[PDB]
Structure formats: C-alpha cells, structure tokens
Amino acid sequence: EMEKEFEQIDKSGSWAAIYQDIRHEASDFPCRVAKLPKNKNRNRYRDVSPFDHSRIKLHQEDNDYINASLIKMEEAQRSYILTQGPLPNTCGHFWEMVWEQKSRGVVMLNRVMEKGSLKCAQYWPQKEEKEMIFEDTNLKLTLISEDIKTYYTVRQLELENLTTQETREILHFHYTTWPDFGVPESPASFLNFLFKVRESGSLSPEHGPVVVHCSAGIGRSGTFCLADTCLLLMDKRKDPSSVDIKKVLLDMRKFRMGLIQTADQLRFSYLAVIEGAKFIMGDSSVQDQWKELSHED
Numbered sequence: 001e002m003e004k005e006f007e008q009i010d011k012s013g014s015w016a017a018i019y020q021d022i023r024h025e026a027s028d029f030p031c032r033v034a035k036l037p038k039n040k041n042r043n044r045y046r047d048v049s050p051f052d053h054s055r056i057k058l059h060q061e062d063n064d065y066i067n068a069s070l071i072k073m074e075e076a077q078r079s080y081i082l083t084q085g086p087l088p089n090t091c092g093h094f095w096e097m098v099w100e101q102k103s104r105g106v107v108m109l110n111r112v113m114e115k116g117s118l119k120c121a122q123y124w125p126q127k128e129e130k131e132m133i134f135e136d137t138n139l140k141l142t143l144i145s146e147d148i149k150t151y152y153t154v155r156q157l158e159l160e161n162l163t164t165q166e167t168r169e170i171l172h173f174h175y176t177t178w179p180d181f182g183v184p185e186s187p188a189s190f191l192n193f194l195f196k197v198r199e200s201g202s203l204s205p206e207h208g209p210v211v212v213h214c215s216a217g218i219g220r221s222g223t224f225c226l227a228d229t230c231l232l233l234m235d236k237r238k239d240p241s242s243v244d245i246k247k248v249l250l251d252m253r254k255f256r257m258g259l260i261q262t263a264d265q266l267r268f269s270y271l272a273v274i275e276g277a278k279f280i281m282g283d284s285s286v287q288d289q290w291k292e293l294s295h296e297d
C-alpha cells in the first residue's frame with residue numbers, strides 16, 4: 001500500500017527527499033518553440049515551458065504557440081491539457097485552444113490576485129451583460145450563470161465562434177481557496193471539488209480534454225491531475241495496492257515539466273488518493289461526507 005509508504009515517509013520525515021528524488025528522475029525534453037524570441041511575451045514564467053513533443057498547437061498560421069501541454073495518460077485513459085494562467089495578450093489564444101480542442105470544462109485552481117501579485121488575467125466575463133470579445137481569435141465569451149460556493153464557484157460560459165456563429169457551453173470550475181505553492185484545506189474539500197468536476201461530465205471521453213490551469217499550470221494543476229488519474233487507475237483495476245503514485249507522477253512529468261511543485265503537495269496527493277480510495281472501492285456514502293465536511297454552502 002501507498003498508505004504503508006505514507007506512514008513510513010511520515011515517520012522517517014522524508015517527504016523532501018522523496019520529492020527531490022522525483023525531480024531528479026523527471027524527464028527533460030526540449031522546449032525550443034517556447035523559447036523562440038517571438039514567443040517571449042506568450043510565456044508567464046521563464047522557467048516554465050511546454051515540451052515540444054506534447055505542446056498544444058493553435059490551429060492558426062500566424063503563430064501556433066501557447067504555453068499548454070497535452071498530458072495523455074495511457075493506461076488510465078484520461079487526457080488533460082495543462083496550461084499557465086492566460087496573459088493579457090494570450091486570452092484569445094486560450095479560448096482558441098478550448099474551442100479547437102473541444103474541451104467541455106476549464107478547471108482554474110488559482111485566483112487572479114495571490115500573494116499581493118497578479119497570477120492570471122481576468123480571461124472570462126464576471127457579469128452576464130458584459131461579454132468578452134477576443135478579436136484576434138474571433139471569439140465571443142459570455143457568462144451564462146454562476147454557482148458560488150464557499151471555496152469554489154462553477155460557471156457556465158458560452159463560447160461563440162464569431163466566424164460561424166457556432167456556440168458551445170463551457171463549464172468553469174474555479175477553486176478559490178487553494179494557495180499558490182500550497183495545498184487544499186482538507187482532502188475532503190479537494191475531493192468534493194474533484195468529484196463535482198467529474199459529475200459534470202467535463203472529464204468524460206466524448207469531450208476534448210479538460211483544460212487545467214493554476215498560475216504556472218504545474219504545481220496545483222499537477223496535484224489535481226495526479227489525484228484524478230490515480231483514482232481512475234484504481235477504479236479500472238479495483239486494485240489500490242497496484243497504484244504507484246510516484247510512478248504515475250513521473251509518467252505525467254513526461255508530458256509537462258515541474259508537475260507538483262512542493263513536497264507537501266505530494267504528501268497531500270497521497271492523502272487525497274488514500275481518502276478517495278474509500279469511494280472508488282465502493283463506499284458510495286463517503287461522497288456525501290466529503291460534501292458535509294467541505295462546508296460548501
């Protein structure tokens with residue numbers, strides 16, 4: 001069990017070493033397009049770039065680059081796009097990708113302001129009558145409604161291709177109480193939120209991959225997807241002991257660098273998967289426990 005390992009690592013106080021072992025072992029692929037001079041203003045952080053092999057290309061001829069990667073989890077059979085928080089000049093690009101990738105959901109795990117700085121552009125409308133137009137990408141975006149909970153909010157956004165007037169519904173799941181380089185308040189409130197996302201059908205394979213972002217698209221995003229894929233893997237096999245969390249994280253790191261940015265987010269991952277396993281292994285009733293613990297109203 002992951003849970004014996006957890007107890008071992010906790011007793012020997014060795015989360016930092018375990019985590020460094022992963023960083024050291026992590027994949028190192030080229031990000032030549034990210035680092036082209038022309039794409040300087042499309043990257044939020046100098047030290048966070050998509051690998052060339054997994055980057056999402058916009059379907060445009062001017063410049064197809066966005067700081068986004070496709071994480072394709074083969075055994076689990078789930079894919080995610082992970083991306084940074086859109087820049088003031090890449091919000092058109094962001095929605096271009098959502099449209100082109102046919103995603104149903106966007107999971108946002110940061111706030112616009114954190115630690116007294118701006119971590120992400122206001123890339124979606126905050127009220128119904130004030131839609132956003134992205135002229136560069138010829139997209140309209142409209143807030144259709146929102147459901148504000150204590151520590152997260154779900155919004156229905158309408159995206160219109162202004163070229164064709166085709167419309168799509170996007171669900172936005174905005175976790176608002178997950179600090180940068182921090183962890184969720186509890187496994188229960190994390191899992192409640194993850195399970196909201198799943199319930200919505202935004203992860204389901206009849207849609208494009210979900211878009212996941214934090215500020216860099218790696219620390220909180222990586223933790224969210226690691227928990228999700230590990231639970232999915234345990235769910236298809238019904239064998240918790242067969243899931244090696246560290247190994248699943250190295251597999252995800254083949255597709256984007258830097259996933260899970262701190263040893264405590266890794267520790268937290270374990271807790272989330274160990275708790276989530278109760279539900280996956282057929283105690284349906286813990287879901288509603290999670291919901292009560294999380295104090296969402």
Ligand SMILES: O=C(O)C(=O)Nc1cc2[nH]ccc2cc1C(=O)O
Pocket residue numbers: 045047048110119180181214215216217218219220221258261
């Ligand atoms: O948003 C997160 O969860 C996360 O991974 N953030 C960050 C990861 C980063 N790696 C290197 C620089 C850097 C900055 C941030 C940052 O947000 O400043």
